[PDB]
Amino acid sequence: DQVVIFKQIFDKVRNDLNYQWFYSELKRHNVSHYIYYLATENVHIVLKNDNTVLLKGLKNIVSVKFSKDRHLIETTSNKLKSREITFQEYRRNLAKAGVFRWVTNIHEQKRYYYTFDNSLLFTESIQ
């Protein structure tokens, strides 16, 4: 199942932190955008024009807080920039920033961070 392949990449990268193979397979599979829900650890990978891959992990739900702040986002990415810390912690602070919709649109080279009310919190170039 193609869902298994995608999920396994994320399962590893959360703690492994290798970005080359991660981003390589990203552009080599996800030619459009994936919608990552930090609320359920569920990911809507909408491919080029192929199909939508739905991942399901960390079955607990509600790991996000409705506290939409843009600075908490940039501070967390700055931390990732320097030490890279851990991908799981990176998303923990993002969930605390009210990021419900992790929409990485590779097709446009943007990573959009939306709150539940679909307001644009922040965005960055995926590199």
- Name the 3-class secondary structure at 68: coil
d(CA 46, CA 92): 24
- Please enumerate in sequence order all residues whose Cβ is within 8 A of that of 43, keeping only pairs 6 or more positions apart, or say none: 6, 10, 34, 35, 36, 37, 53, 54, 55
CATH code assigned at 38: 3.30.1810.10
Q: Partners of 124 in the beta sheet?
A: 111
What residues make up the domain containing 77?
1-127
Which method was used?
Answer: NMR
Q: Are 114 and 120 in contact (CB under 8 A)?
A: yes
Q: Which helix (H) or strand (E) holds 103?
A: strand 101-105
- Please enumerate in sequence order all residues whose Cβ is within 8 A of that of 8, keeping only pairs 6 or more positions apart, or say none: none
Q: Are 68 and 44 in contact (CB under 8 A)?
A: no
Domain total in the chain? 1
Q: Are 43 and 34 in contact (CB under 8 A)?
A: yes
Among candidate residues 7, 19, 21, 11, the one with its CA nearest the CA of residue 126: 19
